[PDB]
């Protein structure tokens, strides 16, 4: 029974380490109906204490809703596409919002203390506990497991958030930062408000540590803490022991944990299947280049008019699975990192970079055949932008060298939104050729758009950052070139001289 | 070579002459034709085809990891060199065109041949047309034919009227070689034929609701590949399906991309034995009237990636033997009464490792599951609850055979 | 039973205890001969500079071993060296040096074909262990014979090494030579589990009380109880940490705590033999020994809380009654026997402690079953068909095209290349899963030393690594992440290389030949003179050993030949290979 043993031992370990006694002593010192605080920069660690007025019984269940686009929302970093909103307990939110004033400077102090590798603890009693959590959740707006994060220790506090919040903080790093010390005699009304984080439950003859929120629900659903800390201290040298939680809860915790471990191993196993799928895409791309179309235009045509058997399999089996897998990977690692030195260690990061640069063009084809505009700023999905950012962060720390006498045939274009630009340019050109009664300010801005695109194209060609397959006869880039050559006239430039003399037929040789 | 072949393989090889040059033919086409022409079994005809590939007289390529089950050969290419077809032609011009047996005819831009005014005595007639064909049909007599093949390239097509004159027809095949689907019309003429038993179409734009309207009283099988269905209507209850279609047993729908909803009438063929909807990637669900097929034996749904669940009325299929859901990636959970089927013996569920087996599957006996190893993790826990279970595992070998269909 | 387990019998215990008693007088060590036996006993110490070195700045006194004097005390594939106590290493290095006439004596005793035994009471015990390892690195590892097998027999010694020390003994099969006797309440086997700061002010008094020589010192109730209390508190935290990360169970909040915790790096090594007045219990499992080091000396009942602090000290001096009267006690080997409840309550363990010890033994069994599964996988026929298709089908057809399978793969114009790529990926997955099990310590200590595994991994690396390099360079992956040897090379190949090199030795690898030629070509010859010279120097040794094949690399269409031919005729006239 791994989970039962761990829970008992971890409660025992935290009790022996000695943070409850120090934190509670500081709380007792600040105490023995407003919001106050104290700061102690001891040699061991910097410790911040909040005190706050007693508990309102009538106002126990009111909450304020927040939203991403709302501007009074202080925590916009933690709401997402699957959770665009969350709601918070009202009185503690008001206390925190009022106190924001000088704890801005305190935030500078505490973040600077953390960056120098010293521990920081934020703690409070019952209502001051909730406020403390808010302050901690305010400091956590920047996370990487290379750098430190605060720890919150909370003695007998009410819940603050609802199920949307505990869904945001379900299996993430931001859970590991909270520690709620609650006697087994307190009962909670969890119809609306929910628990997040890790809990320490203090029985009479021992204590237990539980990280699962279902079990907290099953144990606490429906005191004075100096005595319970004394009782734990005395029970430390007990001569006899029982099991303080029932075995039904143990079975539940074990079951869920085993499921989670299996699902962790599953993606490590499935990455190799994904690589065989990409190999199929490689041979598809090779044939699409042998027939002088390019795989982007072949994919687009066969999406409009399906006629072939290989292409339906490409789209419906290989690309669909690849998209599903990589969305899952990005959804999972951006709440729970790898390797504690970098999320997405090295096989996932470099495979994901290759996947993005091979597979996004087809997502652009789908987007623009379906009848949409402005892909880059309004259309591309989250996992693509995350993959680009994470790889670019590390690509600056590695040494490499690009030869100027190579064969570029098998290069993948570094900007995976190249075809989005081409589609936008084609849209603009046809809107010029088809419009009537159009003003001249708009005509001038459209000419600005064309000149901008010309600059972008010449700067990727000259830098050797595009693949020669954009020069294949039945490409869309060549349709853009033909129509722009018509609507241009004789205004010669660098790009026009490159194309006209037919020097594009030796690029990348 | 041709003479060195035994008698039967002589005409089996001679039948190859009717298909256009370098045409990638699936092995089910000629197998169905041969079954109706020669009354033999499908298995032994596949053995003859393997034999002809052993003497290096044709090429046989599998497209995937399907086995040679009962007459499911929609997954094998027959591919023949030019000169082998030319040799197969060589043996059959000895007799005269009006009294040939195997005659291949060509029509280029409505330049009809001037001997078709006569009375043709072929029993296996093929017709080829080009892009410019305008469906100005000459009137011929062809009373000796039992088979018929129509190669197309047109944007629009009308079946000839003299089809009603072939009182001896048995088989029918239309293949479109154009870029965009052909619009077939003038199709009701077939209602006069008393002997039509198998029909096959490919890459043609058909309003599927026609078949009940057409009184195909003797049709045994109907197969569609890559067809387009257009606007899916349903509201023609005027015609009793079970009386017009008294002899229909198999329907094979393959690669029909736009079919998002299965038609209403196929639930009313109580003579159904097989039903096969494979590679249809817009089909998300099946009608709850499928439980009205009380005599359905086989049911294949291979490689339909978007099908999320199987309908409940699968309880009512009391005759189901074979049940194939290989590579059904969107399938989540089998129906919760799947264990009430007291005849289900086999299942293939390769790549269905993501599908949750309900409890009552323990209420089955002597079943053989074919699956990959990741699927077996679902099938290994429940072993000691099943007195005669077999779980046979093969492996996916990888090849580029489908790059022929590019 | 005991003799069939440990390899020693009663008279050897008797002689070792007598000799280690004699060593209380002589200087630094004491030699004793009896027929075909020679035993060296070592002298203890009871000051503070001989446990925690005053020069050392760290909190436990630890120093890392040296890769040239103890080459085997490391994790092979990873690279990490072991860690020992600095005081004990200093003592050993003082003893070994030529001025002492210690090496000459052991060489005398070894050329005579006799048995060698190292021993000592408490601190001397810690030196004995070190000497044994020194012997094993100098003599036994060069020609391993039963004549040369040593013995180490220690009496209440303190802990000496970290977890890599125990792992390194386990991988070499040397853990069977060491035997350590610990009484139930003896306190010195538990001292080095504490922080130096927690005992620095009360250490010398209690040490003075442990000396059997200067016995004139008198007790103090409070100093004794304080030493005992703090020592057991640090022991408590070390054991709990060990349980909580037995399987990596919810490591998150444990890491968050870990920013607040300092815990000793010392673990048991060898076989540990706990003793009571009724029974002897033997354990080979280090995790179970670490739990029993805390649960055996907790209180049987309540009022015994005042007796334990002094009975610990008094039990440190109870190894004479133990040695003279060990034939009259029942012997039980804990790892094998399955009725541990009676045994472990006889030792005084509670029920929680018993569950923790059971957990440790179960995890060892889980590691053994993991190894069984891996052997089953790699013995099958589909795996070896994947490996034999490259050997017998791909490589010969690529030799018959007159360019070799590296360049054949790098051009990739056929379905045979698609098949090689998919096979390469499948084998990659399997060896990556094994490596991942090794990195979490889910396999037994001796897996990296198994010879079937070394042969398999060497065959795999030498066939398939050229294809991984061809994949890297085929598709321009070396312009996105740099040269192969730095950030491109997978960890499985490095692990295999290190394991093979260790097994035999007791442009650095030949399987990475191609990488070098890809870095070196296309460059002016002045800048690459040295590197081309080193490569063409090691090519002969590689071709003989079988790392590089000779039918492939000299082919007409090959990449290496078409680079070699363009070098200056001044170089091509004096090359070591110009006759190819």
Q: Where does residue C345 rank: exposed (0-12), middle (13-18), buried (19+ CB within 10 A)? A: middle
Which residues pair with residue B298 across a beta bridge? B322
Chain A positions touching C304 (Cβ under 8 A) are none
Question: How far is the CA of C326 from the CAs of A22, A203, C179, in angstroms?
Answer: 50, 46, 15
Whole-number Å distance between alpha carbons of C525 and C568 = 9
Q: Which of A200, A272, A318, A395 is the mutation pick for testing C, counting most C CBs within 10 A?
A: A272
Q: Output the six-digit token pair for B360.
A: 């009552």
A17/C254 CB distance under 8 A: no
Smallest CA–CA separation between C374 and chain B, in Å? Answer: 16
Give chain C's end-to-end CA distance (angstroms, integer).
66
Residues whose CB falls within 8 Å of the CB of residue A502, separated by 6 or more in sequence, listed in order: none
- Domain membership of residue A344 (yes or no) is yes
Strand order in the sheet with A36-41: A36-41, A46-51, A120-124, A151-155, A178-183, A198-202, A207-210
Question: How far is the CA of C195 from the CAs of A126, B283, C250, in angstroms?
Answer: 36, 69, 27
A410/C355 CB distance under 8 A: no
- Domain membership of residue A253 (yes or no) is no
Q: Do residues C47 and C207 lie in contact, with contact meaning Cβ atoms separated by under 8 Å?
A: yes
Measured in degrees and rounded to the nearest 5, phi and psi for residue C9 equal: -125, 180
A173/C474 CB distance under 8 A: no
C260/A17 CB distance under 8 A: yes
B398/C418 CB distance under 8 A: yes
Measured in degrees and rounded to the nearest 5, phi and psi for residue A255 equal: -60, -50
Measured in degrees and rounded to the nearest 5, phi and psi for residue B150 equal: -125, 110
Largest separation between any pair of C-alpha atoms in chain B: 75
Class of domain C2-366: alpha beta
Question: How far is the CA of A89 from the CAs of A96, A176, A402, C214, C364, in angstroms?
Answer: 11, 21, 56, 70, 49
Residues whose CB falls within 8 Å of the CB of residue C431, separated by 6 or more in sequence, listed in order: C457, C460, C492
Catalytic residue among C186, C234, C407, C450: C186
C415/B400 CB distance under 8 A: yes
Whole-number Å distance between alpha carbons of B150 and B146 = 14
Distance of CA B82 to the CA centre of its chain: 26
Which residues pair with residue B368 across a beta bridge? B346, B390
Q: Indicate if A100 and A58 belong to the same structural domain.
A: yes
Relative to beta strand B322-324, strand B298-300 is: parallel
Whole-number Å distance between alpha carbons of A254 and A249 = 9
Q: Indicate if A393 and A407 belong to the same structural domain.
A: no
Q: Identify the H or E element spanning C469.
A: helix C451-474
Q: Which of residues 2-21 of A touch B (CB under 8 A)?
A: none
Q: Output the six-digit token pair for A299.
A: 């994919």
Compute how many other C-beta atoms are within 10 angstroms of the C-beta atom of residue C154: 29
Relative to beta strand B76-79, strand B102-106 is: unpaired
Which residues pair with residue B105 across a beta bridge? B127
In this complex, which of C244, C299, C478 lies closest to A10 when CB atoms are compared? C244
Chain B positions touching C415 (Cβ under 8 A) are 399-400
Residues whose CB falls within 8 Å of the CB of residue B44, separated by 6 or more in sequence, listed in order: none
A287/B402 CB distance under 8 A: no
Q: Output the six-digit token pair for A390.
A: 């994470």
Residues whose CB falls within 8 Å of the CB of residue A491, separated by 6 or more in sequence, listed in order: none
- Domain membership of residue A251 (yes or no) is no
Smallest CA–CA separation between B164 and chain A, in Å? Answer: 32
Chain C positions touching B400 (Cβ under 8 A) are 415, 418
Question: Which of B223, B73, B84, B202 lies closest to B150 in space, CA to CA?
Answer: B202
Q: Do residues B350 and B396 lie in contact, with contact meaning Cβ atoms separated by under 8 Å?
A: yes
Residues whose CB falls within 8 Å of the CB of residue C258, separated by 6 or more in sequence, listed in order: none
Whole-number Å distance between alpha carbons of C194 and C184 = 19
Quick one: CA torsion of B92, B95, B96, B99, rounded to 10 degrees? Answer: -90
Question: How far is the CA of B78 from the CAs of B46, B61, B341, C3, in angstroms?
Answer: 11, 7, 38, 76
Catalytic residue among C316, C333, C473, C502: C316
Question: Which of C438, C441, C390 lies closest to C417 in space, CA to CA?
Answer: C390
- Domain membership of residue A259 (yes or no) is no
Closest residue on chain B to C422 (Cα):
B398
Residue with tokens 């340019």: A425
Q: Do residues A2 and C246 lie in contact, with contact meaning Cβ atoms separated by under 8 Å?
A: yes
Question: Which of B228, B140, B214, B220 lies closest to B184 in space, CA to CA?
Answer: B228
DSSP symbols for B184-230? EE--GGGGG-S---EEEEESEE--TTHHHHT--TT--EEEEES-B--
Q: Indicate if A156 and A236 belong to the same structural domain.
A: yes
Assess B395–C contact: CB distance below 8 Å, yes or no.
yes
Whole-number Å distance between alpha carbons of C448 and C497 = 12
Angle between helices A347-369 and A320-333 (to 10 degrees): 120
Question: How far is the CA of A430 from the CAs of A268, A369, A435, A440, A442, in angstroms?
Answer: 47, 15, 8, 16, 14
Chain A positions touching B400 (Cβ under 8 A) are 283
Largest separation between any pair of C-alpha atoms in chain C: 93
Q: Indicate if A117 and A223 belong to the same structural domain.
A: yes
- Domain membership of residue A471 (yes or no) is yes
Whole-number Å distance between alpha carbons of C552 and C575 = 19
**3-state SS assignment for residue B151:** strand
Q: How many CB pairs under 8 A join B and C?
A: 9
Residues whose CB falls within 8 Å of the CB of residue C379, separated by 6 or more in sequence, listed in order: none
Q: Identify the H or E element spanning A354.
A: helix A347-369
Catalytic residue among C122, C183, C275, C286: C122
Q: Output the six-digit token pair for B124.
A: 């296996």
Question: How far is the CA of A494 from the CAs of A451, A466, A469, in angstroms?
Answer: 12, 17, 20
Q: Indicate if A102 and A83 belong to the same structural domain.
A: yes
> DSSP assignment, residue C123?
H
> DSSP assignment, residue A171?
S
Whole-number Å distance between alpha carbons of B197 and B195 = 6
Question: Which of A468, A351, A456, A467 lies closest to A414 in space, CA to CA?
Answer: A467
Closest residue on chain C to A16 (Cα):
C237
Residue with tokens 């002969």: C540
- Give catalytic status of residue C480 as yes or no: no
Chain A positions touching B402 (Cβ under 8 A) are 309-310, 313
Q: Output the six-digit token pair for A500.
A: 């006209």
Parts of chain C belonging to CATH 3.40.50? 2-366
Q: Output the six-digit token pair for B355.
A: 């599908």
Q: Which of C415, C425, C426 is the mutation pick for testing B, counting most B CBs within 10 A?
A: C415
Q: Do residues A195 and A166 lie in contact, with contact meaning Cβ atoms separated by under 8 Å?
A: yes
- Please give the method by which this entry was determined: cryo-EM
Which residues form the domain of A440? 403-509
Distance of CA B187 to the CA centre of its chain: 19
Residues whose CB falls within 8 Å of the CB of residue C287, separated by 6 or more in sequence, listed in order: C242, C246, C360, C363, C364
Give chain B's end-to-end CA distance (angstroms, integer).
33
C382/B395 CB distance under 8 A: yes
Q: Indicate if A151 and A15 belong to the same structural domain.
A: yes
Whole-number Å distance between alpha carbons of C217 and C214 = 7
Q: Indicate if A197 and A83 belong to the same structural domain.
A: yes
In chain A, how many domains are there?
3
Smallest CA–CA separation between A412 and chain C, in Å? Answer: 9
Q: Indicate if A411 and A390 belong to the same structural domain.
A: no
Q: Output the six-digit token pair for C56.
A: 């050392």
A275/C243 CB distance under 8 A: no
DSSP symbols for A369-425? HTT---HHHHT--HHHHHHHHHHHHHHTSS-----SSS--TTPPPS-TTHHHHHHHH
**C-alpha radius of gyration, chain C, whole number:** 29
Angle in degrees, CA A407, A410, A414, rounded to 5: 105
Compute how many other C-beta atoms are within 10 angstroms of the C-beta atom of residue B93: 12
**Which of A346, A380, A400 marks a domain boundary?**
A400
Relative to beta strand A161-162, strand A193-194 is: antiparallel
Question: Which of A165, A213, A203, A214 lies closest to A181 in space, CA to CA?
Answer: A203
A279/C487 CB distance under 8 A: no
Measured in degrees and rounded to the nearest 5, phi and psi for residue A132 equal: -55, -45
- Give catalytic status of residue C198 as yes or no: no
Whole-number Å distance between alpha carbons of A465 and A413 = 6
Whole-number Å distance between alpha carbons of B351 and B327 = 5
Distance of CA A277 to the CA centre of its chain: 26
Measured in degrees and rounded to the nearest 5, phi and psi for residue B145 equal: -80, 140
Q: Indicate if A179 and A84 belong to the same structural domain.
A: yes
Q: Could you tell me where the beta strands, DSSP code E, fall in B240-385?
A: 250-254, 276-278, 298-300, 322-324, 346-348, 368-371
Q: Indicate if A407 and A393 belong to the same structural domain.
A: no
Relative to beta strand B25-26, strand B76-79 is: antiparallel
Question: Which of C455, C456, C549 lies closest to C504 in space, CA to CA?
Answer: C455
Q: Output the six-digit token pair for A252.
A: 């539940």
Which residues pair with residue A161 across a beta bridge? A88, A194
Question: Which of C456, C441, C241 lies closest to A6 in space, CA to CA?
Answer: C241
Chain A positions touching C475 (Cβ under 8 A) are 410
Q: Do residues B13 and B2 lie in contact, with contact meaning Cβ atoms separated by under 8 Å?
A: yes
Q: Indicate if A66 and A106 belong to the same structural domain.
A: yes
A268/C436 CB distance under 8 A: yes
Q: Identify the H or E element spanning A201.
A: strand A198-202
Compute how many other C-beta atoms are within 10 angstroms of the C-beta atom of residue C121: 25
Question: Which of A161, A164, A172, A101 lies closest to A134 in space, CA to CA?
Answer: A161
Residues whose CB falls within 8 Å of the CB of residue B199, separated by 6 or more in sequence, listed in order: B171, B172, B173, B216, B219, B221, B222, B223
- Domain membership of residue A428 (yes or no) is yes
- Domain membership of residue A94 (yes or no) is yes
Q: Do residues A457 and A403 lie in contact, with contact meaning Cβ atoms separated by under 8 Å?
A: no
- Give catalytic status of residue C339 as yes or no: no
Give chain A's end-to-end CA distance (angstroms, integer).
64
> CA torsion sign, A417 to A418 to A419 to A420?
positive
Compute how many other C-beta atoms are within 10 angstroms of the C-beta atom of residue A402: 12
Assess C386–B contact: CB distance below 8 Å, yes or no.
no
Relative to beta strand C330-333, strand C279-283 is: parallel
CATH of residue A196's domain is: 3.40.50
- Domain membership of residue A315 (yes or no) is yes
DSSP symbols for C501-526? HHHHH---SSTTHHHHHHHHTTS-HH
Discontinuities after residues in chain B (C–N over 2.5 A): none
Q: Do residues A78 and A161 lie in contact, with contact meaning Cβ atoms separated by under 8 Å?
A: no
Residues whose CB falls within 8 Å of the CB of residue C140, separated by 6 or more in sequence, listed in order: C148, C149, C150
Residues whose CB falls within 8 Å of the CB of residue C8, separated by 6 or more in sequence, listed in order: C151, C153, C179
Quick one: CA torsion of C570, C572, C576, C580, rounded to 10 degrees? Answer: -160
Q: Indicate if A207 and A81 belong to the same structural domain.
A: yes
């Amino acid at each position: 029974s791994s989970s039962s043993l761990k829970g008992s031992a971890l409660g025992k370990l935290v009790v022996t380490s000695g943070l409850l006694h120090s934190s509670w002593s500081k709380i007792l010192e600040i105490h023995n109906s407003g919001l106050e605080f104290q700061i102690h920069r001891e040699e061991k660690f910097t410790l911040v204490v909040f005190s706050a007025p007693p508990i309102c019984r009538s106002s126990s269940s009111d909450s304020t809703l927040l939203h991403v686009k709302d501007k009074e929302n202080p925590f916009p970093f933690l709401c997402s596409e699957n959770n665009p909103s969350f709601s918070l307990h009202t009185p503690a939110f008001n206390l925190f919002t009022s106190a924001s004033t000088s704890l801005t400077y305190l935030k500078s102090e505490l973040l600077q203390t953390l960056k120098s590798e010293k521990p920081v603890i934020i703690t409070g009693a019952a209502l001051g506990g909730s406020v403390a959590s808010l302050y901690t959740l305010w400091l956590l707006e920047t996370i990487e497991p290379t750098l430190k994060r605060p720890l919150c220790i909370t003695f007998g506090s009410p819940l603050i958030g609802d199920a949307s919040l505990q869904q945001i903080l379900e299996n993430s790093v931001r859970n590991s930062c909270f520690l709620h010390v609650v006697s087994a005699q307190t009962r909670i009304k969890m119809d609306f408000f929910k628990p997040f984080g890790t809990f320490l439950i203090c029985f009479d003859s021992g204590c237990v540590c539980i990280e699962d929120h279902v079990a907290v629900t099953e144990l606490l659903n429906g005191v004075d803490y100096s005595q319970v800390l004394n009782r734990l201290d005395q029970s430390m040298l007990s001569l006899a022991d029982s099991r303080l939680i029932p075995e039904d809860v143990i079975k539940g915790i074990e079951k869920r944990a085993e499921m989670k471990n299996l699902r962790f191993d599953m993606m490590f196993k499935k990455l190799n299947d994904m690589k065989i799928s990409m190999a199929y895409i490689e041979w598809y791309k090779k044939k699409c280049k042998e027939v002088k179309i390019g795989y982007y235009d072949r994919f687009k045509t066969q999406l409009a008019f399906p006629s072939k058997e290989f292409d339906i399999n490409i789209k419906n089996h290989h690309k669909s699975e690849l998209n599903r897998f990589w969305k899952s990977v990005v959804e999972e690692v951006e709440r729970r990192p790898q390797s504690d030195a970098s999320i997405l260690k090295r096989r996932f990061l470099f495979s994901g970079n290759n996947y993005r640069r091979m597979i996004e063009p087809l997502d652009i084809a789908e987007y623009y055949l379906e009848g949409r505009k402005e892909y880059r700023t309004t259309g591309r999905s989250h996992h693509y932008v995350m993959l680009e950012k994470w790889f670019g962060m590390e690509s600056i720390l590695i040494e490499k060298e690009r030869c100027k006498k190579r064969d570029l045939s098998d290069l993948l274009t570094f900007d995976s939104c190249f075809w989005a630009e081409v589609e936008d340019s084609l849209i603009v050109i046809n809107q010029l050729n088809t419009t009537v009664g159009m003003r001249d300010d708009v005509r001038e801005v459209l000419t600005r758009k064309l000149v901008e695109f010309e600059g972008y194209v010449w700067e990727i060609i000259t830098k050797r950052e595009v693949s020669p397959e954009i020069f294949l006869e039945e490409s869309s880039f060549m349709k853009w070139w033909k129509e722009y050559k018509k609507i241009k006239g004789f205004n010669s430039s660098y790009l026009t001289e490159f194309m006209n003399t037919r020097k594009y037929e030796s690029y990348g040789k | 070579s041709f003479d060195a072949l035994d008698p039967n393989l002589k005409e089996c090889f001679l039948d190859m002459g009717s298909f256009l040059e370098d045409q990638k033919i699936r092995a089910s086409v000629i197998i169905d034709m041969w079954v109706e022409l020669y009354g033999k079994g499908s298995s032994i005809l596949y053995m003859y085809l393997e034999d002809l590939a052993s003497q290096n007289l044709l090429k046989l390529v599998p497209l995937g990891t399907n086995e040679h089950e009962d007459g499911f050969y929609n997954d094998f290419l027959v591919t023949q060199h030019d000169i082998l077809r030319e040799l197969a032609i060589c043996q059959s011009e000895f007799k005269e065109n009006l009294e040939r047996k195997r005659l291949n005819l060509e029509i280029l831009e409505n330049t009809f041949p001037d001997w078709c005014l006569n009375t043709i005595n072929a029993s296996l007639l093929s017709i080829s047309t080009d892009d410019l064909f305008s469906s100005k049909w000459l009137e011929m007599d062809c009373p000796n034919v039992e088979a018929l093949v129509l190669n197309l390239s047109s944007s629009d097509y009308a079946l000839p009227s003299f089809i009603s004159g072939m009182k001896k027809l048995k088989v029918l095949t239309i293949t479109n070689h154009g870029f965009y689907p052909a619009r077939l019309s003038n199709f009701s003429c077939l209602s006069s034929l008393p002997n039509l038993k198998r029909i096959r179409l490919e890459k043609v734009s058909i309003t599927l609701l026609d078949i009940p309207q057409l009184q195909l009283s003797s049709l045994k099988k109907l197969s569609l590949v890559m067809c387009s269905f257009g606007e899916v209507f349903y509201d023609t209850e005027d015609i009793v399906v079970s009386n017009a279609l008294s002899k229909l047993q198999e329907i094979d729908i393959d690669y029909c991309y736009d079919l998002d909803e299965l038609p209403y009438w196929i639930s009313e063929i109580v003579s159904l034995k097989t039903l096969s909807i494979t590679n249809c990637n817009k089909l998300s669900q099946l009608p709850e009237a499928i439980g009205n097929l009380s005599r359905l034996e086989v049911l294949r749904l291979c490689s339909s990636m978007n099908l999320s669940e199987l309908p409940e009325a699968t309880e009512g299929l009391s005759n189901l033997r074979f049940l194939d859901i290989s590579h059904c990636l969107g399938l989540r959970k089998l129906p919760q009464e799947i264990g009430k089927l007291q005849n289900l013996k086999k299942i293939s569920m390769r790549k269905c490792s993501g599908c949750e087996l309900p409890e009552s599957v323990t209420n089955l006996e002597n079943l053989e599951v074919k699956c990959d190893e990741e699927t077996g993790l679902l099938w290994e826990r429940l072993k000691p609850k099943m007195r005669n279970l077999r779980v046979q595992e093969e492996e996916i070998e990888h090849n580029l055979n489908l790059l022929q269909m590019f | 039973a005991f003799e069939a387990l440990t390899g020693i019998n009663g008279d050897l215990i008797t002689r070792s205890w007598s000799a280690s008693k004699q060593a209380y007088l002589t200087e630094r060590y004491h030699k004793e001969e009896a027929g075909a036996v020679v035993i060296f006993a070592f002298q203890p110490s009871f000051s503070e500079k001989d446990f925690f070195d005053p020069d050392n700045k760290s909190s436990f006194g630890e120093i890392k071993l040296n890769r040239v004097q103890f080459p085997c005390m490391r994790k092979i594939g990873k690279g990490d060296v072991a860690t020992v106590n600095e005081a004990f290493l200093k003592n050993l290095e003082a003893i070994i040096d030529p001025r002492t006439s210690f090496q000459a004596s052991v060489e005398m005793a070894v050329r005579s074909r006799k048995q060698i035994v190292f021993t000592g009471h408490s601190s001397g015990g810690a030196t004995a262990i070190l000497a044994t390892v020194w012997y094993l690195e100098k003599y036994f590892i060069r020609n391993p014979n039963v004549y040369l097998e040593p013995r180490c027999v220690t009496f209440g010694a303190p802990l000496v090494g970290d977890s890599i020390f125990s792992h390194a003994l386990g991988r070499e099969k040397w853990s069977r030579f060491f035997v350590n006797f610990v009484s139930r309440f003896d306190i010195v086997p538990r001292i080095m589990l504490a922080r130096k700061a927690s005992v620095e002010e009360t250490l010398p008094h209690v040490l003075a009380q442990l000396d059997p020589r200067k016995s004139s010192v008198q007790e103090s109730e409070q100093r004794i109880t304080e030493f005992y209390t703090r020592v057991m508190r640090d022991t408590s935290t070390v054991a709990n940490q060990a349980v909580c990360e037995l399987t990596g169970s919810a490591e998150a909040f444990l890491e968050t705590l870990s920013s607040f915790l300092e815990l000793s790096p010392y673990r048991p090594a060898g076989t540990f033999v706990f003793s009571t007045e009724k029974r002897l219990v033997a354990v080979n499992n280090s995790d179970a020994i670490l739990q029993m080091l805390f649960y055996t000396s907790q209180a049987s009942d309540e009022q015994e809380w005042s007796l334990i602090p002094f009975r610990s000290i008094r039990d440190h001096h109870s190894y004479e009654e133990l040695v003279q009267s060990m034939g009259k006690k029942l012997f039980n080997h804990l790892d094998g026997e399955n009725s541990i409840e009676s045994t472990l309550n006889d030792l005084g363990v509670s029920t929680r402690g018993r569950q923790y010890v059971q957990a440790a033994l179960e995890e060892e069994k889980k590691r053994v079953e993991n190894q069984k599964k891996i052997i089953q996988v790699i013995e099958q026929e589909r795996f070896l068909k994947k490996l034999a298709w490259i050997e017998d089908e791909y490589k010969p057809k690529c030799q018959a095209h007159k360019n070799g399978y590296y360049d054949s793969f790098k051009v990739s114009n056929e379905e045979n290349d698609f098949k090689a790529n998919v096979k390469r990926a499948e084998l990659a997955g399997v060896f990556d899963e094994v490596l991942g099990l090794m990195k979490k310590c889910q396999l037994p200590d001796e897996f990296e030393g198994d010879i079937d595994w070394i042969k398999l991994a060497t065959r795999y690396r030498r066939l398939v690594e050229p294809l991984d390099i061809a994949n890297y360079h085929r598709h321009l992956k070396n312009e996105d992440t740099g040269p192969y040897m730095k950030r491109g090379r997978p960890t499985r190949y490095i692990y295999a290389q290190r394991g093979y090199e260790h097994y035999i030795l007791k442009s650095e690898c030949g399987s990475c030949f191609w990488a070098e030629v890809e870095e070196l070509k296309g460059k002016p010859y002045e800048e690459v003179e040295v590197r081309v010279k080193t490569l063409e120097g090691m090519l002969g040794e590689w071709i003989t050993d079988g790392e590089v094949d000779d039918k492939e690399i000299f082919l007409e269409g090959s990449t290496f030949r078409k680079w070699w031919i363009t070098l200056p005729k001044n170089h091509k006239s004096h090359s070591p290979l110009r006759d190819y």
